[PDB]
């Protein structure tokens, strides 16, 4: 309550008490570097109408290696992910497509485009996850041996390839011999002359398609392990997934290949934690309920703390004493005649009384509290059982 004066009563408070300290970054154990060669530092790329595809697996991929001695990149655009977070993720599957175009056509390799390089040669789905890379290769690409389809009746579908070379009619189907004015050849060659204007120069385009699912990862990035720290509110960074919580041994079952388990509300509470493959359990850093009983700021400054649905045996486990300040350890795990167990919960900071009175500050389950002195002539909080008459 955003104030400096509080009236007497019981209030329910937020946590503001415990915060994580440690980080655990368990990641798989693989050391093979991904073959960025023969993809970037290759010798031949196919035509756009007959484009290649390849699959990369069981490898570690850091992009910093591309910094040393590799040519810069004129176009580097990502759609489903941000470039600043590609070094902290693991992907279930990755595919690489690669082809060659002319410069003015580089703009066409993107979702929702029109033109000859998007309806008759190569189309991307609307919901594309992955990145597009494009760079100039004028010096190495020459000659007249790069083709793109110019004539077609319909339009292609996403991730589909056409490799046919059949004559194209202009009023219908079928044309056997070529010569008749109404018959054309459906392919055309990209003239790549040494002295040609910019925009008519060759470019190499590589498309990376990602897929993140509940499956074993294969193309993880560079991180380092930190070993497990149980029974302490911590920061955990298992493969891809991030969050905070307490990790504990668990005995659940996973359907063989499976990474994590959730509930009806989509809350992760189990991790396969590779290199041991032993299923753990995740719990929130604090849960349940804590309430504060006070007699008024202008009257005194001594307060009592009620933990609901907690039995006075695992309070040091429910409340992390080893991670709170010294002013909170006078509560929790200690007993100077202050721990008390009611049906509503555990009360810390007050002493029990046998005589019955009316109710001033209702605690619950027939238990009330009030402010008064005792035989030692000190102000304190007295808890008792409500009197019905």
């Amino acid at each position: 309550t955003k104030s400096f004066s509080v009236e007497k009563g019981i209030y329910q408070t937020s946590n503001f008490r415990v915060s994580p300290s440690t980080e655990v970054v368990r990641f798989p154990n693989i050391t093979n570097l991904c073959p960025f060669g023969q993809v970037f530092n290759a010798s031949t790329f196919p035509s756009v109408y007959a484009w290649g595809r390849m699959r990369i697996s069981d490898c570690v991929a850091d992009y910093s290696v591309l910094y040393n001695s590799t040519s810069s990149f004129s176009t580097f655009k990502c759609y489903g992910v941000s470039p600043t977070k590609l070094n902290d993720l693991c992907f279930s599957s990755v595919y690489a497509d690669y082809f060659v175009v002319k410069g003015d056509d580089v703009r066409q390799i993107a979702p929702a485009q029109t033109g000859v390089i998007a309806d008759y040669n190569y189309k991307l789905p609307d919901d594309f996850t992955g990145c597009v890379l494009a760079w100039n290769t004028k010096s190495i690409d020459k000659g007249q041996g790069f083709y793109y389809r110019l004539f077609r009746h319909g339009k292609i579908k996403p991730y589909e390839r056409d490799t046919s070379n059949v004559p194209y009619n202009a009023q219908g189907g079928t044309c056997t011999d070529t010569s008749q004015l109404n018959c054309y050849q459906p392919l055309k060659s990209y003239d790549f002359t040494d002295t040609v204007g910019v925009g008519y120069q060759p470019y190499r385009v590589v498309v990376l398609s990602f897929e993140l699912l509940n499956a074993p990862a294969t193309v993880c990035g560079p991180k380092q392990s930190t070993e497990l720290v149980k029974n302490k509110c911590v920061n955990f960074n298992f493969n891809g997934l991030t969050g905070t919580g307490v990790l504990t041994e668990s005995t659940k079952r996973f359907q063989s290949f499976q990474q994590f388990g959730r509930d009806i509300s989509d809350f992760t509470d189990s991790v396969r934690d590779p290199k041991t493959l032993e299923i753990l359990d995740i719990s929130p850093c604090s849960y349940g309920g804590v309430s504060v009983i006070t007699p008024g700021t202008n009257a005194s400054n001594v307060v009592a703390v009620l933990y609901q649905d907690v039995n006075c045996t695992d309070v040091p486990t429910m409340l992390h004493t080893e991670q709170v300040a010294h002013d909170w350890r006078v509560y929790a795990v200690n007993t100077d005649g202050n721990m008390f167990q009611t049906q509503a919960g555990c009360l810390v900071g007050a002493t029990y009384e046998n005589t019955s009175y009316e109710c001033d500050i209702p605690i619950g389950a027939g238990v009330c509290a009030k402010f008064g002195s005792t035989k030692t002539r000190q102000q304190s909080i007295l808890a008792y059982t409500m009197s019905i008459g």
Binding site: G243, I264, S283, Y287, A344, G364, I388, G389
Partner: protein, 419 residues
């Protein structure tokens, strides 16, 4: 069904026997007390979401204030319904009062449960990885009621003992002692039936009362759908909370329903655009839940006010209102506790086995017309008698029970007779 009867200008029907009937009424009183932690439900354990939610004002203070007000109002409802006495009267060990046997509505000392058998029956026939483990992980908690079941049972036992030993006099001052048959005679006298009927048929009435109470217990055992009005109150609550949890599985047009997935792949320019949809959707769900709870609490407040009025007017007195404390002329009522509600057992009087006679609105004597002070005049074929409406008990004609007003010229329906 049709029961076509035309008319009759000179006939009166008077009943000549009666039955003691016990009816059951069920009334909800309170509902579950629920608390919500905004930060945990909307954001969970992410600091970025908390910082963004700090910019939305004081919506959560309003939500928590509304919920806390409802929670306090529930305890206030229970206290206003049940705590209508200042002192607790001890349960008399001898539970037979002049025949009438309270064996079934007062707690038996030999049973450690310290409750009534009918109360035990009612508490048995109301029934509610895990589900409560998902509510707690997301900030939804249920708070225990202030008054325990034992204190409510004590209140009920004190009320029953007081009305058994001291009548209804303990609702208007200090309790005054009176035997139970005298109280029953007073209650009979309340509804226009002379108190001689109870004394002359004391054994029959006592046996009818005991048999009626036993049959009510049996009918409670047999029919399962009698208490549904209370059961729905539980269900409509639980089905709400669970629904809220399922709403965390929606994405509201974003890329995912998991905040960590959004924060592990996207840069802030699109991260905020994705986050705001989730935050707005969750705020909308929480607000809808709170509004529905407020409306339901208003309805239960109306029900609690009705129950308090019924306890004040039927348990602490005899009411003349028609069809308020039961079907029939009211004799008394008894309260019993039940999960989130009260059950009233109404003991009432039902006429039966009627008979039909000839009537006349007045009698002439010496030219002066005598009219009934309180009764009605009937003919048994030979003699003219005066009889009360609710029971057949004729009395011979005399100047005491009839009054004279005017002559017998404009009088219609008068008959010639002597005194």
């Amino acid at each position: 069904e049709d029961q076509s009867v035309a008319y009759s200008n000179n006939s009166i029907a008077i009943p000549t026997n009666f039955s003691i009937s016990v009816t059951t009424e069920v009334l909800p009183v309170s509902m579950t007390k629920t608390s919500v932690d905004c930060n945990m439900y909307i954001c969970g354990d992410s600091t970025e979401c908390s910082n963004l939610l700090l910019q939305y004002g004081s919506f959560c203070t309003q939500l928590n204030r509304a919920l806390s007000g409802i929670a306090v109002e529930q305890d206030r409802n229970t206290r206003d319904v049940f705590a209508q006495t200042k002192t607790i009267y001890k349960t008399p060990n001898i539970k037979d009062f002049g025949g009438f046997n309270f064996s079934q509505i007062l707690p038996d000392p030999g049973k450690p449960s310290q409750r009534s058998p009918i109360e035990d029956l009612l508490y048995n026939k109301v029934t509610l990885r895990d589900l409560i483990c998902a509510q707690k992980f997301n900030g939804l908690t249920v708070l225990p009621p202030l008054l325990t079941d034992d204190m409510i049972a004590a209140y009920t036992a004190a009320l029953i003992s007081g009305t058994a030993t001291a009548g209804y006099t303990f609702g208007a001052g200090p309790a005054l002692q009176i035997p139970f048959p005298m109280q029953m005679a007073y209650r009979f006298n309340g509804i226009g039936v002379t108190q001689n009927v109870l004394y002359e048929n004391q054994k029959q009435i006592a046996n009818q009362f005991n048999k009626a109470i036993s049959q009510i217990q049996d009918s409670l055992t047999t029919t399962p759908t009698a208490l549904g009005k209370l059961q729905d109150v539980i269900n409509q609550n639980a089905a709400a909370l669970n629904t809220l949890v399922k709403q965390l599985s929606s994405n509201f047009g974003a890329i995912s329903s998991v905040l960590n997935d959004i924060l592990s792949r996207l840069d802030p320019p699109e991260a905020e655009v994705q986050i705001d949809r989730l935050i707005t959707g969750r705020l909308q769900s929480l607000q809808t839940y709170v509004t529905q709870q407020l409306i339901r609490a208003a309805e239960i407040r109306a029900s609690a006010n009705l129950a308090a009025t019924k306890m004040s007017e039927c348990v602490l007195g005899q009411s003349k209102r028609v069809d308020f404390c039961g079907k029939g002329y009211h004799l008394m009522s008894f309260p019993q506790a039940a999960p989130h509600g009260v059950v009233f057992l109404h003991v009432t009087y039902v006429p039966s086995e009627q008979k039909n006679f000839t009537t006349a609105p007045a009698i002439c004597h010496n030219g002066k017309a005598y009219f009934p002070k309180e009764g009605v005049f009937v003919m048994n074929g030979t003699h003219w008698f005066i009889t009360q409406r609710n029971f057949y008990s004729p009395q011979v004609i005399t100047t005491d029970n009839t009054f004279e007003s005017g002559t017998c010229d404009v009088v219609i329906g008068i008959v010639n007779n002597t005194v």
